[PDB]
Symmetry: D2
Subunit: 505 residues, 4 copies
């Protein structure tokens, strides 16, 4: 007999695992426990801090919630108004010396007129083709060209998405983008070109909220803190090293054994196959594809430059920089970096020069967070990527050569993005049912490998819905029907359901 | 203080109400109670019997289940293999002196060649138009013509559906038919014409099961028998006369008062509004439309004629009979009519004349069940409808003039079909949320008025999912997303979920 | 026996009649003669002069020749380089305070940005419709909208063409515009809008030549002068009053009778029917439709204004003036108006006021020629049309209020344009072959009533080809195939053919 | 100084040259003469006879006249009713053991049903493609598939046209086929399939007339006999060996020189280029492509077999015979073969057997004329082609193994068909203008190399129109606008025009 026995065991305390725990804790029926190899919950939604006091998320993390249940739990975890800062969803694309408002195609009036003509001509071709289209696009690349036409595709979405996914657009499926017809809004595009107009897809009602303190990781620490501590096991003491699917037993690194009736696993499914010593599953999961993520952080001395302003995140299709995305992380919360009175020495100038003085000087400070993707199709030199990012900051005119860098950060995350390859579904529909047959719910960004339901709210809810399926026979909608859950506000499931109301009576 | 207080009150013990009761009974959390004005549960899924021993459902009732939960409850209710008879889904269209296998358009090779030419010419027009179509059809009629072309539309779906819905096809929406593109399968249709081929949409894997005894009503009696009797109130004692939504109180005909926290109402929503004495709701529910259904039963002396054979149900576009559908109800179970040894006198010949003998004679017997629709747009002479139906049987060569009729049945059901009018949804999105705000879940064939989720299984699950929404915060998928539930095997929810398993341990 | 007998009699000595005469003279086989009621040949291609010395054509006459034969005869008639002035085909559309280069749609960058948006949106609609179009347009209006889209149609071609044709665009056929598919060049139109480009359809290789002296009428006087005088009868002595088609006899006003073997009639075909005393034909010709042309001429003191410049003709869609076309006739030849030293008193100012003195002042002078259409669908108040035109010149900023008018001209031409109505071809097929069967070739702008072959070169060649059909069995290509002759350089037929080269040898 | 001088020299007395001569003779203006290397006029429209008395044209020659002038000359040449036999245009396609009436696609009901399905499915694809097509086909093959769809294309037009043209369909242009849109008449094809109908494109309307005596060649002998003998030079006496274009001199084989002002050359333009000793023209003409024609004639003993009946000509797509076309030449005139009382020995049976008796026996006789094409892409073994043709007659069930052959004929015509290659126009538009600049009108089947105007009437009229261009400045419509002349009734030009009527006065 095992050291511990529970009805439902949850492996991992990122958002998905925490969702499973929150729903299990609410239901308060079957016995359960959650484990994690990290002492701090949060997974890829955690936050680091440099010795100089600059916080960095695991790349740009902006919350858009499709679910009231998610909202309930974040509200519970961080209930005060000053626990959060609200911002508009302000983003741009760097192109040919310009900050072009997203969406790119509605703002090409900023480009040279000859380029506008080529763009519009290509979109006219796409519009005429779409009028007689009777097939769906099969690849991400086809989807892009049918939507934008060749000229606009070539300027932004084609080169940008290679930099993001670290695979060519021709090697990815497009079903993950949803049911919308791949067709241009030619009138919208020509109208803004004709009016010489720019317009971003943000405004007073297109906002996100960010935690005042501790970065995105602050949320998940706070959510985890609402759980009964004795049902959690976080740290080296919580590291899973072996899963015996046949005996429904998990072994931890310290030798502790846990018996389960149902297993919710949120570790990367390729790690799970290895932990299970299941050769067939190892083979299948190796057919999946993922990219790694390099997160680079740069802390800069000075008040926020006017050229930066209220920018939140920034997309980079061009090859004068290695990152695909920059986030003005200092814009998300004043507590993502030190206060202005904090004294820090200049480490280097943005052009690589040594500072004139080694003396600690005061702020204020601002902060840029960068992401560079890596895969077998897109190698990254770990030894030079930081310097290359900083040079890229000068090339893109985010930093002047003279700007004073007072903190740097670089961390590589092996499993960064689960890639929507052409082969993904053919592989997943072999893996997930085999795991299911063994009473294993493998769920999450790399637990079930579907990027289109791979944000914090989707992950949280994948855990919630897995538990609801286990206990109440609910449909796992987020898992199997991304278009469904993303196309509605999911309002029915709440942190207090009828069940708990009636029980308290 | 009311006489009785429960957390959830269920009004009606047709399939919807019994669904709610079954789920409540399973969850075994909130207190509940179910009432019906009829001593016998089943509603429109009940069965009558004539004094001569011939059973009749409320028109043709053939089960196709989209849900494992529904299967579980029928299996529990009637667990023995001999509780059921299995049949292939054999149906035909009566057209120009012939029985044309369904689907009609795949079988027009049976028609005169000149008529085939007109049919194919019409479908070629429809295919060519479909090739450049960039709008969705807005009416049932438009949908029909885009699918079939004019010729085929005029032969079957146009005149048949007026006979069915008692409103013209131009006055109905078409969303209720699903998301499939309205376009002809020209190749399939021309291929069968070229090959001189007929092919029905049935076979060994296209079957239905029917209760051995008591007709369809036998199911719902048996399902209801699994509920705790003290939580049921069926008959005059269970007739709801008044609903006070603000007090959350229901008053029964015998004066009994019931307080509720949540109400699941499965009576027709126009009747609920009246019982609520809510004039705004009364006004809104009067914007809905329904047809009445006349059910006519004819019991016939003789072994089953070869011309009838294994036919199950039959559709009648033509004017030579008033019914839209006939069911060979004696093919569904041998216990739907008397045994051969039963002595019964002939009441009349099918040609309407008196029998030569008044003497009771033996069987065997077979049985025809007919449906005639009625609305304000399609009046029916009730005084002559039995005789008209019987002459219709002679006109369509179902009965010979000399066939001996030993039993007749006629009953009018006021609320027969909830009509998918163009106006339906605009009206329902005013009614259903207004009731919802008052903690009233109005659900079912006329509880929520959506035909596309209006069969026995849909109805049962509307009740189940309403309770699940009330208690566990489930999405009411059947109610709000008919295409979703009808397009998949719904397997997740079971009569025994993890909750019951874990609690029993 | 008649007073005169010829093989071929030509009625009318406008361009069509003169063409027949020239070919007859060249062939020099069958006997012939030509008559006209006017002492001066030229018909609608004649020129008037005011008592103050200002010439006016019958509205704007610009020669574009599709035929070498026509060139040969014009070269023969006016062989000197200084007999002609060459100009580029410079024309504009007046729209919203702007002179917009023709073609209008390539030049809408001159309009406000909001007008550009409306124009391009409309043309986008037309492009998408054209992509799936499988029918030809049936009316001029349909043709226009398919070519231009609604916004551009509404700004120019729709209102302009009513002002031109004196019938709505919806009442005219569109085959006369040729076989080019009615579809927009969206790329060309958007490209010029994006680039902020204008471009007229003229240049060094898009020119016309205009007679140095005597206006357009000088040409036909000179052409007629090359004919043997004794084969002409021009003036009251040449006025046809009766045509007896059965006797093949023509009676002139002075009583002279002419017997013919073949008749080439170039008078308006409705006049011919009357002269034939043929009630059936009269009835048919009354089914045809034509507009009348008011020609207004305005002579102005001053050197040519900068705002006018090298403009040749101008189109006016807007309702701030009654004319559809203005011609800067003083730009066509310096001899279309008096020399600068000629003394003329001011008749009125452009604002309508009287001048101070009767003092004759010198020039220089320039000259505007206007056209206003009239029909039963579009009446013209003859008493005020001169004053209305002059106010139109002020409204359109062609004349300043203070500009000094030194000469005015107004003349109404009853048969101005033969209208391409929907009914035209159906009526002509009943008329022209009936005349043909009587050895009457009715040809010309109103002889055969086809505007698309109704210019001077077309008309001349209708006369030439009729004779060629009569004598040499040639196809009448201009008459029956406008698209054919207008889409090629017709080079084969010359004023000296092999026949004459060989004969002289 | 040349031996003879004429205004117009005509080389060749096939139909083109005779057209030129007839029009020259009619005009009776410029002096002229016509020469041919053959003592008998007719060119490829001539007729041979075997020593046994069987006539053979140069393959199937069926007249369809597009011109009144052509009709006039044939009527003049052979004015008696009994100079001609009239027949309906009866033709079939040999396919899979069946004689399928032309047009093939309207008669595929004769094929197996499974094959009808494949044909109709292919034509449905083509119909749906044609609905959204926005480009013209560029090759004969693309045109075929767009008209017929793949299945029908593969059965007849694709293999047949290779056997006809001796080049693949992918190597030919399709403009020569005319302006009709390449698109299926799907309804016509499905209608006949559904009705089980066969229908040929012939009837009392669709007829041809064939000369009573001398074959097609009798026409051209008779036409030539209307020319003044002294202006003709036929035989070795008239063989052109050299054309000196710069001196406008022709040299004949006997040394006679002829000076001309204008040359109408109807010899093959590649021979002309050689005769001109013009290396540039030789190079260009070698870029043209042509196929050779083998004509095989078989005289058969017996009354006309029932299986043959009234068939006129027959097309052979399949590879069980080398010929592409068979003509029942004995159906064209009773005088194409000996009378029944003429005695002839059997040469062989159709299966190659020796006859039982060597004795002369009587008829009646019938007669088959066959065509086999040859090119560098499709060699023909001249030593075996007769035997292979005869075996082909057995294979196609035209002859029984027992049928008695009493006469055979084989002749190879080097220039048979001018090929409408993709390259043809690019080459001709270089050749013909250069010849034109030297006053050489090269015209005819190989004079101007355009098959679509390469029949007897087209050829005749090319000659007529060249003369008309030389003398009267006529447009050469047949040469430059095949679509124009083939799409109309050309009635204007007559053998007696006004010019001759007036002159006789
Ligand atoms: O503006 C007009 C007035 C009259 N008509 C003709 O004149 C006839 C009446 O006289 C009508 O039937 C028309 O054919 C015309 O064409 N335009």
């Amino acid at each position: 007999h095992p050291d511990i026995s529970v009805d439902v065991l949850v492996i991992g305390a990122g958002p998905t695992g925490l969702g499973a725990a929150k729903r299990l804790n609410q239901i308060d029926g079957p016995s359960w426990m959650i484990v994690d190899s990290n002492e701090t919950p949060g997974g890829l939604a955690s936050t680091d801090v440099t010795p100089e006091g600059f916080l960095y998320d695991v790349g740009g993390h902006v919350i858009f919630s499709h679910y009231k249940y998610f909202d309930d739990c974040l509200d519970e975890a961080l209930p005060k108004e000053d626990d959060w800062y609200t911002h508009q969803r302000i983003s741009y694309v760097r192109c040919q010396g310009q900050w072009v408002p997203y969406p790119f195609q509605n703002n090409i009036s900023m480009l040279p007129k000859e380029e506008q003509v080529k763009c519009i001509d290509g979109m006219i071709d796409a519009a005429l083709e779409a009028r007689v289209a009777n097939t769906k696009p099969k690849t991400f690349d086809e989807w892009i060209v049918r939507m934008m036409g060749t000229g606009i595709a070539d300027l932004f979405m084609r080169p940008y998405n290679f930099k993001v996914w670290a695979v060519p657009t021709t090697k990815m499926q497009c079903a993950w983008l949803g049911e919308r017809v791949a067709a241009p809004n030619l009138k919208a595009v020509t109208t803004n070109v004709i009016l010489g107009k720019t317009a971003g897809n943000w405004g007073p009602n297109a906002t996100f909220r960010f935690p005042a303190r501790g970065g995105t990781g602050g949320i998940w620490i706070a959510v985890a803190n609402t759980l009964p501590k004795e049902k959690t096991r976080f740290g080296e003491k919580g590291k899973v090293t072996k899963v015996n699917a046949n005996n429904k037993t998990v072994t931890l690194q310290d030798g502790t054994t846990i018996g389960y009736k149902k297993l919710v696993s949120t570790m990367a499914v390729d790690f799970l196959a290895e932990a299970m010593n299941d050769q067939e599953l190892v083979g299948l999961t190796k057919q999946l594809f993922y990219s790694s993520t390099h997160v680079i952080g740069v802390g800069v001395r000075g008040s926020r430059p006017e050229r930066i302003g209220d920018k939140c995140w920034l997309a980079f299709p061009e090859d004068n920089c290695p990152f695909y995305r920059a986030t003005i992380f200092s814009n998300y919360s004043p507590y993502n970096q030190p206060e202005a009175s904090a004294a820090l020495p200049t480490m280097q100038l943005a052009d690589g020069s040594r500072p004139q003085s080694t003396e600690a000087k005061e702020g204020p400070y601002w902060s840029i967070m960068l992401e560079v993707s890596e895969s077998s199709m897109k190698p990254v030199n770990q030894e030079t990527i930081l310097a290359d990012c900083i040079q890229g900051l000068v090339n893109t005119e985010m930093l002047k050569p003279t700007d004073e860098i007072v903190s740097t950060y670089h961390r590589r995350f092996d499993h960064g993005y689960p890639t929507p390859t052409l082969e993904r579904e053919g592989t997943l529909t072999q893996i997930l049912p085999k795991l299911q047959d063994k009473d294993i719910w493998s769920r999450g960004r790399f637990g079930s490998w579907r990027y289109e339901v791979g944000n914090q709210d989707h992950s949280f809810m994948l855990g919630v819905e897995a538990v609801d399926n286990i206990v109440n026979g609910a449909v796992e909608l987020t898992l199997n029907y991304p278009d469904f859950v993303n196309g509605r506000q999911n309002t029915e499931r709440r942190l207090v359901d009828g069940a708990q109301v009636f029980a308290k009576s």
